[PDB]
Design a protein that fits this description.
The protein has 7 helices and 13 strands. It is an alpha+beta fold. The chain has 2 domains: about 90 residues, no CATH class; about 170 residues, no CATH class. It has a 6-stranded antiparallel β-sheet with strand order 1-2-3-4-6-5, with helices on one face. A 3-stranded antiparallel β-sheet has the order 7-9-10. Strands 8-11 form a two-stranded antiparallel sheet. The protein is globular and about 55 Å long. It binds the ligand CNc1nc(Nc2cn(C(C)(C)C#N)nc2C)ncc1C(F)(F)F and chloride ion (2 copies). The ligand CNc1nc(Nc2cn(C(C)(C)C#N)nc2C)ncc1C(F)(F)F binds next to strand 2, strand 4 and strand 7. The site of ligand TVT has 16 residues, from strand 2, strand 4 and strand 7.
Length: about 260
C-alpha cells in the first residue's frame, strides 16, 4: 500500500491522463480524503491548483492542499464517499424525477457559484458530478477549468475541450464563444441523462442525424419520449443551438418544472 506522509493510498477512484485519484486514509486520525497524484514527468497544474484554492461552496469539491515530492504532485480534496452521479443513472431508465430535480438544483447552485467567481468548468458530465454521504452533489475535476471573467471583464474562449456528447454546438462551429452558455448546455445533457438514462447524440453537429431530429422537434423519438412534458419544456429552452437565444441560469430558476414540487 503506497503512502504520503501520514496517509495510506488505499483504493483507486479514477485514472485518466492526469495520473490517478486515490482514497487516502490517515493512519493516526482515520480521516478519509481523495488525493489526485500527477507524475509531472509524464503550467496546467499551476493553474488547476490556483483555481482549486478559489473554491469554497457546498456543491463544489473542496481543496485541502498539495505536496510536490520530486516529479509527483499530491492534490488533497474532500472525498465524496457516495461516488458519482454516473452510477445512479440506470441505463435506458434514468432515475426518479424527484432525485433528478434535486441533483439539477444542486448542479445549478454549483455552476452559479463557479460562474460568479469567473470560472468555467468546461467538462460537466455525470463522471464529474460526485455525491457526499448525504447524496449532496459536488462538481469535481478542475483540470479543464479556466477564467472567463477577470476584473469584471469577460473573455471569450477559443480552446475546444470537454466531452463530445456534452459539448455545445457553438464550440464546434465558432472561432470564439461565451463560456457560460456552454456550461448551461452540458447541464441540459446531464438532465437528459438523469431522466432518460441515454445521451441524445454523439455530438451536436448536423452531420449527426439525432441532433437534426431534435432541431426538427421530433420528440416522439428516444430519449425525449421517456421524459415528461414539464422537464422536456425546460430541455427545449436549454438545448437551443443559438447560444444568445439559450436560457440563462436566472431564467432556468423561473422554469415551471424547476419550481414543481416532487416526491
Ligand atoms: C474521482 N475523484 C474523486 N472521487 C471521490 N469519491 C469517489 C469516486 N468514486 C468513483 C465511483 C468514481 C470510483 N471509483 N467513488 C468514490 C467514493 N471523491 C473525490 C474525488 C475528487 F476530489 F478527486 F474529485
Ligand atoms: Cl451505457
Ligand atoms: Cl448515461
Amino acid at each position: 500500500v503506497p503512502f504520503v506522509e501520514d496517509w495510506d493510498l488505499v483504493q483507486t477512484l479514477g485514472e485518466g491522463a492526469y495520473g490517478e485519484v486515490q482514497l487516502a486514509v490517515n493512519r493516526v486520525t482515520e480521516e478519509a480524503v481523495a488525493v489526485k497524484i500527477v507524475d509531472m514527468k509524464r503550467e496546467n497544474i499551476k493553474k488547476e491548483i490556483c483555481i482549486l484554492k478559489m473554491l469554497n461552496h457546498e456543491n463544489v469539491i473542496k481543496f485541502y492542499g498539495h505536496r510536490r515530492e520530486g516529479n509527483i504532485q499530491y492534490l488533497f480534496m474532500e472525498l465524496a464517499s457516495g461516488g458519482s452521479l454516473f452510477d445512479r443513472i440506470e441505463p435506458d431508465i434514468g432515475m426518479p424525477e424527484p432525485d433528478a430535480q434535486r441533483f439539477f438544483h444542486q448542479l445549478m447552485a454549483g455552476v452559479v457559484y463557479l460562474h460568479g467567481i469567473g470560472i468555467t468548468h468546461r467538462d460537466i458530465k455525470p463522471h464529474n458530478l460526485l455525491l457526499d454521504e448525504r447524496d449532496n452533489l459536488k462538481i469535481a475535476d478542475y483540470s479543464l477549468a479556466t477564467v472567463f471573467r477577470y476584473n469584471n471583464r469577460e473573455r471569450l474562449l477559443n480552446k475546444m475541450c470537454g466531452t463530445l456528447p456534452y459539448v455545445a454546438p457553438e464550440l464546434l462551429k465558432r472561432r470564439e464563444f461565451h463560456a457560460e452558455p456552454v456550461d448551461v448546455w452540458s447541464c441540459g445533457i446531464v438532465l437528459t441523462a438523469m431522466l432518460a438514462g441515454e445521451l441524445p447524440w454523439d455530438q451536436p453537429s448536423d452531420s449527426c442525424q439525432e441532433y437534426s431530429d431534435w432541431k426538427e422537434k421530433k420528440t416522439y423519438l428516444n430519449p425525449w419520449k421517456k421524459i415528461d412534458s414539464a422537464p422536456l419544456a425546460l430541455l427545449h429552452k436549454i438545448l437551443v443551438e443559438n447560444p444568445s437565444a439559450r436560457i440563462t441560469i436566472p431564467d432556468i430558476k423561473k422554469d415551471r418544472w424547476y419550481n414543481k414540487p416532487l416526491k
